[PDB]
Amino acid sequence: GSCKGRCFELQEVGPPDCRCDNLCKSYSSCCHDFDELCLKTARGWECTKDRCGEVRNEENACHCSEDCLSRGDCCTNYQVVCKGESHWVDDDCEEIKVPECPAGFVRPPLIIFSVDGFRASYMKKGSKVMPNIEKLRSCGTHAPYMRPVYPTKTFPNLYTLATGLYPESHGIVGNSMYDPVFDASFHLRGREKFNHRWWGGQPLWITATKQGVRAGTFFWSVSIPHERRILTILQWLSLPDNERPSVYAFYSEQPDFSGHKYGPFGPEMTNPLREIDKTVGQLMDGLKQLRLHRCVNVIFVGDHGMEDVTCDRTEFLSNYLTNVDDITLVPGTLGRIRAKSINNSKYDPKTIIAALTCKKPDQHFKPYMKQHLPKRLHYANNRRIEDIHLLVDRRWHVARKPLDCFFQGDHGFDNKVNSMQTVFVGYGPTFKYRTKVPPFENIELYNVMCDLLGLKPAPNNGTHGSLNHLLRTNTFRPTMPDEVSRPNYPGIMYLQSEFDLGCTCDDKERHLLYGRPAVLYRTSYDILYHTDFESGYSEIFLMPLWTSYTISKQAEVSSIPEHLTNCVRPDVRVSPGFSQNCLAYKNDKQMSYGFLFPPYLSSSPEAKYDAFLVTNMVPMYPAFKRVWAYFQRVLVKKYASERNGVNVISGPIFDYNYDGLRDTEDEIKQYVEGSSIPVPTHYYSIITSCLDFTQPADKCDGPLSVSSFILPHRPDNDESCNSSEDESKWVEELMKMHTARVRDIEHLTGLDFYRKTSRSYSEILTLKTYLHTYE
Numbered sequence: 001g002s003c004k005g006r007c008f009e010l011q012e013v014g015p016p017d018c019r020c021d022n023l024c025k026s027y028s029s030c031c032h033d034f035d036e037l038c039l040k041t042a043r044g045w046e047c048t049k050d051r052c053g054e055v056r057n058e059e060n061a062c063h064c065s066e067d068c069l070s071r072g073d074c075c076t077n078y079q080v081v082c083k084g085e086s087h088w089v090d091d092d093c094e095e096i097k098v099p100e101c102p103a104g105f106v107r108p109p110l111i112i113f114s115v116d117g118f119r120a121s122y123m124k125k126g127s128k129v130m131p132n133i134e135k136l137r138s139c140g141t142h143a144p145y146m147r148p149v150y151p152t153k154t155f156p157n158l159y160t161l162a163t164g165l166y167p168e169s170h171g172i173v174g175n176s177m178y179d180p181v182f183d184a185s186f187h188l189r190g191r192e193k194f195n196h197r198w199w200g201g202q203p204l205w206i207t208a209t210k211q212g213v214r215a216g217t218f219f220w221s222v223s224i225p226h227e228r229r230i231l232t233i234l235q236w237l238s239l240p241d242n243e244r245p246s247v248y249a250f251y252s253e254q255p256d257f258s259g260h261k262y263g264p265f266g267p268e269m270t271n272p273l274r275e276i277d278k279t280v281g282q283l284m285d286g287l288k289q290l291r292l293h294r295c296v297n298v299i300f301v302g303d304h305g306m307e308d309v310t311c312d313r314t315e316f317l318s319n320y321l322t323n324v325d326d327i328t329l330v331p332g333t334l335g336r337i338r339a340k341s342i343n344n345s346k347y348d349p350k351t352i353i354a355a356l357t358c359k360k361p362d363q364h365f366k367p368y369m370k371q372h373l374p375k376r377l378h379y380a381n382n383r384r385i386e387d388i389h390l391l392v393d394r395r396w397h398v399a400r401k402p403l404d405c406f407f408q409g410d411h412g413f414d415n416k417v418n419s420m421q422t423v424f425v426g427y428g429p430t431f432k433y434r435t436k437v438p439p440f441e442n443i444e445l446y447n448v449m450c451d452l453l454g455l456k457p458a459p460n461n462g463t464h465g466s467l468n469h470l471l472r473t474n475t476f477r478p479t480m481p482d483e484v485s486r487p488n489y490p491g492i493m494y495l496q497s498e499f500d501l502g503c504t505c506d507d508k509e510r511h512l513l514y515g516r517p518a519v520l521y522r523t524s525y526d527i528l529y530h531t532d533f534e535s536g537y538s539e540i541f542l543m544p545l546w547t548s549y550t551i552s553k554q555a556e557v558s559s560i561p562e563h564l565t566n567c568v569r570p571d572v573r574v575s576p577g578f579s580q581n582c583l584a585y586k587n588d589k590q591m592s593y594g595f596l597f598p599p600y601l602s603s604s605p606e607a608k609y610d611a612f613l614v615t616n617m618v619p620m621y622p623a624f625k626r627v628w629a630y631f632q633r634v635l636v637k638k639y640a641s642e643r644n645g646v647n648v649i650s651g652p653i654f655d656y657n658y659d660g661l662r663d664t665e666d667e668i669k670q671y672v673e674g675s676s677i678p679v680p681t682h683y684y685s686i687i688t689s690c691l692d693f694t695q696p697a698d699k700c701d702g703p704l705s706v707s708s709f710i711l712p713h714r715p716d717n718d719e720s721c722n723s724s725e726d727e728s729k730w731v732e733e734l735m736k737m738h739t740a741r742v743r744d745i746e747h748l749t750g751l752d753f754y755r756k757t758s759r760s761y762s763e764i765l766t767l768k769t770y771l772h773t774y775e
C-alpha cells in the first residue's frame with residue numbers, strides 16, 4: 001500500500017499489491033505515496049557548493065551528502081561541484097579498448113537513449129548546442145544518418161528498433177490501426193495500446209530476459225521528468241549483480257514536440273536540442289561518477305526526422321471522391337482508406353483509386369494498392385494495412401474534408417526522404433573509436449544490440465553481420481548460404497526442327513563479374529552462355545531467374561534490325577518442353593514479351609541473334625515494355641557512361657502474396673493464356689561497378705558500387721501521370737521510386753549474389769543492404 005523504498009523497483013507484479021513501477025501512472029495503479037516519495041523535486045537536480053556535505057534530507061530530489069554514492073542517489077554533478085571532478089564532456093576522448101567495469105559485471109551494460117524526431121541534420125545545427133552529444137559522436141561510432149522504416153511514425157519505428165522487424169511483421173504498422181480479426185482499433189492515445197495482442201515479434205527486452213539477461217523498463221511515464229529517468233537508470237546500475245539489469249532505455253519526447261510546432265529548422269529548435277544535451281551530460285556525468293563511463297555502451301538513436309509541413313498544404317479527398325462520407329481515412333503524411341462498411345454500398349476499391357489518380361496537375365499524393373507500393377517499403381503483408389494507400393508528397397498532408405496553423409512540422413513520409421532521416425551514435429567499449437560508418441537502416445540495430453549483449457537474436461529482417469563494421473569486438477561471424485540447387489550446364493541437345501513453339505524469326509568471365517548467383521531453393525536451372533551475357537534459365541518458370549551481362553563505358557547502342565523485330569529463335573540447348581511458346585503471346589492479347597539481355601547492346605550483328613533466343617524472353621505488358629525498352633536502350637549505356645562500365649543482373653520476381661518472399665509455383669496467380677508460363681509481379685536489375693570510378697568495372701580491385709531496382713510489372717502506366725510524355729520525362733523517375741536493396745531482391749528471388757568477390761563477406765553484406773536513395 002506504500003512506495004517506501006519501493007520507488008522504481010523492477011518487480012513484476014500482477015494484481016494486486018499496488019504499484020510503484022516506472023509505468024504505474026499510465027496504468028493508474030500507483031500506490032498513493034508514489035508522487036511524494038517517488039516523484040521528488042525539492043531543490044532541483046544539480047548539486048550546489050552549499051549543498052556539499054549536507055545532512056541527508058530524504059525529501060530532496062537528489063542528494064549531495066557523503067552517503068549519496070553509497071546510496072547511489074547523488075545528483076549527477078556531485079563530484080564536479082563537491083569533489084572537484086571534471087565534467088565528462090570537458091575530458092579528452094580516450095579510447096576504450098577493453099570494458100573497464102566493476103567486478104561482478106558479467107556483461108558490458110547497454111543503454112539506449114532514444115529521441116523523438118531527431119533529424120540527422122540537427123547534428124551539425126548544434127555542434128555548440130550539443131557538446132556532450134558531439135563528443136559521443138566524434139569519439140564513438142556514428143553514421144551520417146539512419147534510415148527509419150515506413151511509416152516514419154514513432155511507434156512503428158520504436159518497435160522496429162526493438163525487434164529488427166518491418167512494421168508489417170511486428171504489427172505496429174502505424175500509430176493508428178484497425179485490426180479486422182480483433183474488430184478493434186489501436187491509437188497512440190488510449191489503453192488499447194497496452195494490450196499485448198497488438199505487439200508481435202520479439203522485442204529486445206524479451207529476447208534478453210528469455211536468455212537470462214535482466215532488463216530495465218524501456219518505457220517511462222510522461223509524468224516522470226527526464227532528469228528523474230536519468231537518476232533511476234543510474235540507480236539501477238548501482239544494484240547488486242543479482243538485481244542489476246544489463247540493458248536500459250531512456251526516451252525523450254523531444255525534439256519531435258518542438259519540431260512539430262515551430263518547424264524543423266526554426267531558431268526555436270536550439271533550446272530543445274540543448275535540453276537534450278544536458279540530459280546526455282547528466283547521464284555521462286552520472287556514469288563517470290559511478291566510474292561506469294568506460295564500461296557502458298551507449299546508443300544515441302532517433303525514430304525519424306521532421307519536415308516542414310503546414311495545414312495550408314493539404315489535399316482533400318472530397319475534391320477527388322464523390323462519397324467521402326462512405327470512407328475511413330487515416331490522414332496526414334500517409335493515407336489509408338478503408339470502407340465505413342456501414343452505409344457503404346457505393347464503396348468500390350477500383351472506382352476509389354481511379355478517382356484519386358492523376359486528377360490534378362500538381363497532385364501532392366498518389367493512390368496505391370498496397371501490393372503496388374514500392375517494395376523497399378515492405379508495407380503490405382499485414383491485415384492491419386488497408387489495401388488503399390496514399391503516398392503523400394513531402395511537406396504535404398492529406399485529409400478527408402477541408403474541415404479537418406497549429407503545426408509547422410510533421411513526419412511519416414516515405415523513408416527515403418532526407419527530412420525523415422534520423423541519427424545513430426554508438427559510444428562504449430564494444431564500439432569503434434573515432435570511427436565512421438555508412439548510413440544504415442534501423443532494422444539492423446536489433447542484431448547489433450543482441451551482439452552487444454551476447455544475445456541470440458530472434459528471427460528478424462536485419463542482415464546479421466551487415467553492421468559488424470560498427471564494432472571493435474562482440475564479433476558475429478557471417479557464413480555464406482549454401483547452394484541448394486546446383487546448375488546443369490546443357491549442350492546442343494535438340495534440333496531446330498524438333499521445336500514447334502509457334503516462334504518465328506527471319507534468322508538466316510567478363511559478364512559474370514561477381515560469381516554465379518546461388519540458387520537457394522530446390523529447382524532445376526541451366527546456366528546458358530552467350531557472347532554478350534550469361535543466364536540461369538529456370539526450366540520450371542520457363543524463363544531466366546538471373547541474366548548477367550557487362551556493358552563497358554565505350555559500348556555502342558544499336559537498333560533492333562527491322563527483319564528481327566518480331567524474331568524469337570529456339571534455343572537448341574533447352575527442351576521444347578522447358579521453353580515458352582510464341583503462340584501463347586499471340587493468344588494473350590494483353591500480354592507481350594521482352595528480353596532480359598537487351599538486343600540494343602549486342603556486341604555484333606551476329607551476336608544480337610542470341611538476344612532473340614526464346615530463353616531470353618519474358619512476359620511483358622505493352623505498358624511495361626515502354627519502361628523496360630527505355631531502361632534497356634537508354635539508361636544502361638547511360639549508367640555505363642557515368643560509372644565506367646556496369647555489370648547488370650536482370651530478372652523476374654514473383655510475389656503475388658506481397659510477402660516480399662519468392663513465390664512458389666502454387667503462389668503464382670497469373671499465367672499467359674493457355675500457357676504454363678508465369679507472369680512476374682516485378683522485374684529486377686542489379687547494376688554494379690567500381691566505387692573507384694577510375695577503374696573499369698571488369699578490373700576493379702576494391703569496394704563495389706551498386707544500384708538496384710524492383711520495377712512493378714503493371715498492365716498500365718497510371719502510376720506515371722507523365723506517362724504520356726516521352727520516356728525522357730518519366731521512366732527514370734519511376735525507376736527511382738522503386739530503388740531496391742540487393743538484399744530485397746535476394747528475398748524476392750531466392751538468389752544469393754556476390755559470392756565470388758575480393759571483398760569480405762561482412763563488406764558484401766553491407767553492400768547488399770545499401771539502398772541508393774537518389775535524394
Ligand SMILES: CC(C)CCC[C@@H](C)[C@H]1CC[C@H]2[C@@H]3[C@H](O)C=C4C[C@@H](O)CC[C@]4(C)[C@H]3CC[C@]12C
Binds near residue numbers: 199206
Ligand atoms: C502510455 C505510454 C507512456 C507508455 C506505452 C507503453 C506500451 C507501448 C508498452 C508498455 C509495456 C509493453 C509490453 C511489455 O514490454 C511486454 C511485451 C511482451 C512482448 O512479447 C511483446 C511486446 C510487449 C507486449 C510490450 C508491448 C509495448 C508495451 C505494451
Ligand SMILES: *[C@@H]1O[C@H](CO)[C@@H](O[C@@H]2O[C@H](CO)[C@@H](O)[C@H](O)[C@H]2NC(C)=O)[C@H](O)[C@H]1NC(C)=O
Binds near residue numbers: 165459660
Ligand atoms: C522478416 O522476418 C520475419 C521473421 O522470420 C519473416 O517471416 C518469417 O519467414 C520465415 C521464412 O520464410 C517463415 O518460416 C516464418 O513463418 C515467417 N514468420 C512467421 C511468423 O511465420 C519475414 O519473411 C521477413 N521479411 C522479409 C521481407 O524478409
Ligand SMILES: CCCCCn1cc(-c2cc(=O)c3c(O)cc(O)cc3o2)c2ccccc21
Binds near residue numbers: 114161162163219221
Ligand atoms: C531496442 C529497442 C529500443 C526502443 C525503445 N522504445 C521506447 C518507447 C517509448 C517509451 C516512452 O516512455 C514513451 C512516452 O513516455 C510517451 C510516448 O508518446 C511514447 C513512448 O515510447 C517504445 C515504444 C515501442 C517500442 C519500443 C520503444
Ligand SMILES: [Ca+2]
Binds near residue numbers: 461462463743
Ligand atoms: Ca536486411
Ligand SMILES: [Ca+2]
Binds near residue numbers: 656658667
Ligand atoms: Ca511471395
Ligand SMILES: [Zn+2]
Binds near residue numbers: 153304
Ligand atoms: Zn516519434
